[PDB]
Amino acid sequence: RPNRLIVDEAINEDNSVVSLSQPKMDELQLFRGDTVLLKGKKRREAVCIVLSDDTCSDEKIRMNRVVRNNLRVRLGDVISIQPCPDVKYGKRIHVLPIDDTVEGITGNLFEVYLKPYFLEAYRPIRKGDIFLVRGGMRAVEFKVVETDPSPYCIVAPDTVIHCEGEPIKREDEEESLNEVGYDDIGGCRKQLAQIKEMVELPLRHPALFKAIGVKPPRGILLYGPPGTGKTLIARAVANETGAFFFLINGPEIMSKLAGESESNLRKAFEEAEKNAPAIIFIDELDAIAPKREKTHGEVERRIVSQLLTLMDGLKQRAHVIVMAATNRPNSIDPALRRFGRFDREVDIGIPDATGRLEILQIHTKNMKLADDVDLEQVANETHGHVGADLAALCSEAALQAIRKKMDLIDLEDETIDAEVMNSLAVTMDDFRWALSQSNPSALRETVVEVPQVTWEDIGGLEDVKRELQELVQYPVEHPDKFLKFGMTPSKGVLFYGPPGCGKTLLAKAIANECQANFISIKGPELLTMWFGESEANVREIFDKARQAAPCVLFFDELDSIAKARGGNIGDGGGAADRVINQILTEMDGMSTKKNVFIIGATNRPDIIDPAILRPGRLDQLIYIPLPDEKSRVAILKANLRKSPVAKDVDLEFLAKMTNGFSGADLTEICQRACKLAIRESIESEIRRERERQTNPSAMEVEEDDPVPEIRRDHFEEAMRFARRSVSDNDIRKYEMFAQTLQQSRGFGSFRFPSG
Amino acid sequence: ESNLRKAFEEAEKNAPAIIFIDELDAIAPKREKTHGEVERRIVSQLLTLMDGLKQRAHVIVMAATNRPNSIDPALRRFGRFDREVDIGIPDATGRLEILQIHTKNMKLADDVDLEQVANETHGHVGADLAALCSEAALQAIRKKMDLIDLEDETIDAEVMNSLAVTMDDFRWALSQSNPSALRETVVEVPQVTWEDIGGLEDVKRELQELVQYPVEHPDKFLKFGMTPSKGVLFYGPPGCGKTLLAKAIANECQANFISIKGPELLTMWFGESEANVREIFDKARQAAPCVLFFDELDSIAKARGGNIGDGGGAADRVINQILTEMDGMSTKKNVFIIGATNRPDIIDPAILRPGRLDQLIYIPLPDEKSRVAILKANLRKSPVAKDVDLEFLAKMTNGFSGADLTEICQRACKLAIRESIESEIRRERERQTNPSAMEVEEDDPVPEIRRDHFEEAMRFARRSVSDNDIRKYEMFAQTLQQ
Amino acid sequence: ESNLRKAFEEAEKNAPAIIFIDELDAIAPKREKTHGEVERRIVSQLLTLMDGLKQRAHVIVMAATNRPNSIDPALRRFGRFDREVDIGIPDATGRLEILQIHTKNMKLADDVDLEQVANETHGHVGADLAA
Numbered sequence A: 001r002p003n004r005l006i007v008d009e010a011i012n013e014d015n016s017v018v019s020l021s022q023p024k025m026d027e028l029q030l031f032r033g034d035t036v037l038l039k040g041k042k043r044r045e046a047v048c049i050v051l052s053d054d055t056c057s058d059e060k061i062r063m064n065r066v067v068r069n070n071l072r073v074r075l076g077d078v079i080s081i082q083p084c085p086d087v088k089y090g091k092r093i094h095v096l097p098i099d100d101t102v103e104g105i106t107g108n109l110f111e112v113y114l115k116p117y118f119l120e121a122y123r124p125i126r127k128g129d130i131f132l133v134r135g136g137m138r139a140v141e142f143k144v145v146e147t148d149p150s151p152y153c154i155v156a157p158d159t160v161i162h163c164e165g166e167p168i169k170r171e172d173e174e175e176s177l178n179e180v181g182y183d184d185i186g187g188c189r190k191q192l193a194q195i196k197e198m199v200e201l202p203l204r205h206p207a208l209f210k211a212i213g214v215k216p217p218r219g220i221l222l223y224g225p226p227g228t229g230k231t232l233i234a235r236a237v238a239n240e241t242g243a244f245f246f247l248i249n250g251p252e253i254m255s256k257l258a259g260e261s262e263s264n265l266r267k268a269f270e271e272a273e274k275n276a277p278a279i280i281f282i283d284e285l286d287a288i289a290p291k292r293e294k295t296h297g298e299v300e301r302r303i304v305s306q307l308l309t310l311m312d313g314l315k316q317r318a319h320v321i322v323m324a325a326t327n328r329p330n331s332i333d334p335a336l337r338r339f340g341r342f343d344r345e346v347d348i349g350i351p352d353a354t355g356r357l358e359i360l361q362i363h364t365k366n367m368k369l370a371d372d373v374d375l376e377q378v379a380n381e382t383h384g385h386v387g388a389d390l391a392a393l394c395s396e397a398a399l400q401a402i403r404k405k406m407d408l409i410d411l412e413d414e415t416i417d418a419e420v421m422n423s424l425a426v427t428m429d430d431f432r433w434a435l436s437q438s439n440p441s442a443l444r445e446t447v448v449e450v451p452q453v454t455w456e457d458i459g460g461l462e463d464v465k466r467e468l469q470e471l472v473q474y475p476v477e478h479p480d481k482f483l484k485f486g487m488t489p490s491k492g493v494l495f496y497g498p499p500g501c502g503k504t505l506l507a508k509a510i511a512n513e514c515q516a517n518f519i520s521i522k523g524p525e526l527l528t529m530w531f532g533e534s535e536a537n538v539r540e541i542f543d544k545a546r547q548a549a550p551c552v553l554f555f556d557e558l559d560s561i562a563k564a565r566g567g568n569i570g571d572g573g574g575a576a577d578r579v580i581n582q583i584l585t586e587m588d589g590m591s592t593k594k595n596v597f598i599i600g601a602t603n604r605p606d607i608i609d610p611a612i613l614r615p616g617r618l619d620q621l622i623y624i625p626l627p628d629e630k631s632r633v634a635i636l637k638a639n640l641r642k643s644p645v646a647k648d649v650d651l652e653f654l655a656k657m658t659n660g661f662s663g664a665d666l667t668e669i670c671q672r673a674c675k676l677a678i679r680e681s682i683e684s685e686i687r688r689e690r691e692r693q694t695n696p697s698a699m700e701v702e703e704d705d706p707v708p709e710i711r712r713d714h715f716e717e718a719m720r721f722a723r724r725s726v727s728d729n730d731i732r733k734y735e736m737f738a739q740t741l742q743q744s745r746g747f748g749s750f751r752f753p754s755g
Numbered sequence B: 001e002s003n004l005r006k007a008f009e010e011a012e013k014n015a016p017a018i019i020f021i022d023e024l025d026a027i028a029p030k031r032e033k034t035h036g037e038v039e040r041r042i043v044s045q046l047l048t049l050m051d052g053l054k055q056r057a058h059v060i061v062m063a064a065t066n067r068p069n070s071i072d073p074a075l076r077r078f079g080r081f082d083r084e085v086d087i088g089i090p091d092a093t094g095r096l097e098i099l100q101i102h103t104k105n106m107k108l109a110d111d112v113d114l115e116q117v118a119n120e121t122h123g124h125v126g127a128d129l130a131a132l133c134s135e136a137a138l139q140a141i142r143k144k145m146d147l148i149d150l151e152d153e154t155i156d157a158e159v160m161n162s163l164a165v166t167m168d169d170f171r172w173a174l175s176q177s178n179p180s181a182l183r184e185t186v187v188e189v190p191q192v193t194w195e196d197i198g199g200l201e202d203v204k205r206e207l208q209e210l211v212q213y214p215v216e217h218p219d220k221f222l223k224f225g226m227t228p229s230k231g232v233l234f235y236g237p238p239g240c241g242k243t244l245l246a247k248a249i250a251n252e253c254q255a256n257f258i259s260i261k262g263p264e265l266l267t268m269w270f271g272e273s274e275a276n277v278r279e280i281f282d283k284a285r286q287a288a289p290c291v292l293f294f295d296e297l298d299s300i301a302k303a304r305g306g307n308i309g310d311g312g313g314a315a316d317r318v319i320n321q322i323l324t325e326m327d328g329m330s331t332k333k334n335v336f337i338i339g340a341t342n343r344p345d346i347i348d349p350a351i352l353r354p355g356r357l358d359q360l361i362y363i364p365l366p367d368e369k370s371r372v373a374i375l376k377a378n379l380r381k382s383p384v385a386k387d388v389d390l391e392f393l394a395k396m397t398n399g400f401s402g403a404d405l406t407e408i409c410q411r412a413c414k415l416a417i418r419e420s421i422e423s424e425i426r427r428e429r430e431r432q433t434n435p436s437a438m439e440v441e442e443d444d445p446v447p448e449i450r451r452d453h454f455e456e457a458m459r460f461a462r463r464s465v466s467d468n469d470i471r472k473y474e475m476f477a478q479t480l481q482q
Numbered sequence C: 001e002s003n004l005r006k007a008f009e010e011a012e013k014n015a016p017a018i019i020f021i022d023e024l025d026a027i028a029p030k031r032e033k034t035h036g037e038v039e040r041r042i043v044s045q046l047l048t049l050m051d052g053l054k055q056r057a058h059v060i061v062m063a064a065t066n067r068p069n070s071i072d073p074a075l076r077r078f079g080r081f082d083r084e085v086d087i088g089i090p091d092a093t094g095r096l097e098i099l100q101i102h103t104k105n106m107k108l109a110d111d112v113d114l115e116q117v118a119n120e121t122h123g124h125v126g127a128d129l130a131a
């Protein structure tokens, strides 16, 4: 019977929309916008409009809460969908309001609610259905008790709707559709998917897990930077799946006068057991169960013990699930991680790039953005921001836009005109001004993201390209071959070469090509942990790297520590010992099954301690040569691609004269010409302005002042200031070390011995 | 304290019974850890109630704690808690038994071989294994999918009628496994046998003379007035497989093996020094007999020599503690200590004294037949095909350690993988170019680990060890010879 | 706690108000400084009452303090105190205006050189100039 569909949580909040997958439409020959009949329990029927959505699975039907209550069904059940091609345009529809929704209004229901809701909607409606219409503050639920024709009818412009009479009573099924959904969460795709996987099944089907004897999770710790909107995620999940979300705040359990505080907690838990499938949310967990050494009195210990005893008291009983939020996974008491208590941890990281866009596209819903607004550019230029910061930025941009045009909207008051204020299309200047006066919150925080650097940016270094290809791509793409052959992949690679070049660019390019997270570690923070705390920091860095597997960890300037060891200090060697030993010990404990690569780059190889260069640690050594011809041309093209044009010069000629030049020097050479262009353009503008003040309106017509192009003469002007960044002796030392290493692998070939 | 007194009084009234106290550290931590006065009152009440068990009834009190140092030493006097039992992390057999116990109600498929499944779970406990089983079942469920079905009020039977768990489920669960042991020492009888290593008849003879004899036949030792040697120090070129020798002799002696590495030794300089050494040697003693193994013993001096000259104090601290701890050993327990190093001339002379590490054994590089045997040990793999002779492979590889041979063996598999993957990609491309040209599933290229693969792999043969080291070691040996 | 609460609902029931909490560091100090137990309760009460400003509210809360390190970090999340303004020490010109307002009631002579005084008073605040 390939006609039924299993209901699932939907995204669209409209009362008459259902989301279907394309194979279902192809199988049932259902078009877009047609009326379909849905049947559930209690012999109830409803009419819906088919809408396209590729997110939903073929077997699952996305269908909202209002029709879910109309059909007297719950999520996870099965409904019957059939085509309804016999629908006819309605003649008259009689609707009545519920008694406990019109309390204290005293107004025209038709003009405020019915007319805007039924305008250009063509909603098919049926007798006995409940539909919810939003208003100023409340949401009014209306019931169709009479229709013509019955039971199926289509709202049409020539339809008489009556809304006069005594309101009907409550339907005892709450017939509601409200509050947040999945559309209000952005930039958390992976985390939201993970939360859905392990929370939906124990709640939607409270017996299938018991059939296989799978223990559902009994506690989930969502930890991340503050302000990311974890409470919103929990509320959306609870409201979508269907539960009794009971938020208990942190400080509210501490302001009470001692004893009764504990009682409150106890009450909450029992208050959450009668209602069946409930999701308790303990916000600000660190404020009531902090680190043990922070505690100084006795009440906090009693509260912690009470919480632990109750949490162990959730053994079986109902399907209640405990979700707690904190800041970092080391501030809470270390005793709240024993099996049975909080054991699953989810990292809600800082949104990056693409995700940020959706956040803005959520906030700029009602506001009418101008055509000149480029939200993609705003998302790209803004980094280190969280949802709260972006919301505040949008709010202050709107405030600036309305402040500029104050007198045009009758600055006094007088029932502010909606169209006039809506005409305030926010401009790009407003967004830039808001960006200038906006202090972010993330700032100093490690960022995990997928880089966008591609291989064509660098020349390619086809030998090194193939070597890194073999080292990285194959283990993750095809691990079946490795497990068949039993070979254990290499875990570390060490680069060496002249300073600058393309180390970081190569690492980011291979990380992008492998489609894996990237983490950048630099020398200054290495020396930061050198001067003091040297054990923990590396530990949580490695746990963070492991948690987001697969990833390509990068250690930049690993030799820097040694640079501190060899000098006139002779005091921090203990710190270097601490750092190196911690790094080596943590690499030794890294299981080979987890795909966490480690790439370290050192400018001076032979100073580093030969302890690292041993099996089980960074094994392969790769020499990165200076860019030559083709790589130089690629770097120059990438640099010039940013904005200006150079359609007057020969690039391979410049590459010919620039032998022995590193990539950074080429970037500086490209940058100098732009400064020359800026100076010439500004001086020309000043000359034009001065000759304009000498004779008013001297150039009435705006001619072609120097437009963007880097002319040839600018290229000689910039190139005259060129530096040989690296001296030849550095190349001599690098090649001498390379040949010293290579001479080990020297043997007089082979002759197929006795085969 | 009223509840505790009531519990003890009730247990007194109801015949010989067992009282279990869970999380004893939560109620009786160290005295100086305690801050207020309620904790001290509770601890003293517990002490008094414990001391009040004179006769009374046949009541036995059993308590569980995580670490043996968190307990207030007041709860260690005779009459109070005096017998200690350590429930260590289960070994491979224990993991297999736990997996057998948990995978009872689950209807598995006829494709499960839990041997390597337990083998690949180094560092897990019972709860982690149960979570892994649940995750595997959960993948079984989500791969089945609730594709428009009517599991209402009959869900359990309707799903249990036909379900199974396959290899891919357990593989995923192994990927999504976060072990809880990790940073924790391991004690278990090793598995490496004498066949794994190659030759070295004299070293094996000496090791079995100094290890196997005093444990299997201690009566003759006592009759003849024997004090067996307590320590042996291995020295030689690096990468010769000293740890293999130690593990093999431990396996032959059927004694537990405990390993301590270099980085941990250097880490113990800065911060906790007394506690770690004390607890590790106590743990070695309690699990007698055991062969305690120290790796990279010379690294201490390797940090002393440099432009810093500040870590020498902590190095002397650790070495002093270790020396004082060996001097306290007793012949009662068969505790054996083995040290390994590659730079013996920088070892402090205080170590090489009677009672401490005295016997020195030089480990020569594998030669001729030993190279054949180590390759044969490496010759297992899964995909060895039929291969070729190896005597001249040993003949050509004079002066090559085990690490170089392992690298040479590993490089050939890399070339084979590259060949197989490039062939597969070319085949996939030609499938796109010509549809339906490979309707029949033609067999993929076999594991052709062929002569040419080895020939190209061992073209990059590295002389990892130099030549002057051998004369240095033989000069040191001649210095020993008198 | 009763006084602070009563002040909050008293400000709630009257008009758009501006509650000014003076010397905030005296009641919400650094975590390590909170040796007692009453301070934690007062801080929690303040946080809860601050968060109890649900949407419909005309109350704006302003606070005064020294360098923004003595204030406990939990008071600087989103929803609580978020906007910060630095009232720096006035410069020579600012000192000139401070002298100007402070001397409007005063009857000065014809030898007064307010510009020189403003120039020479580097390192002073309004109270010092008033004194």
Ligand SMILES: Nc1ncnc2c1ncn2[C@@H]1O[C@H](COP(=O)(O)OP(=O)(O)O)[C@@H](O)[C@H]1O
Residues within 6 Å of the ligand: A183, A184, A185, A186, A187, A226, A227, A228, A229, A230, A231, A232, A325, A359, A362, A387, A388, A389, A391, C078
């Ligand atoms: N789609 C979204 N993704 C992430 N954050 C959001 C989104 N929409 C709103 N937010 C932010 O969530 C905040 C509210 O969540 P909050 O109660 O602060 O949770 P928490 O206290 O866990 O940070 C708002 O300030 C808003 O800026």
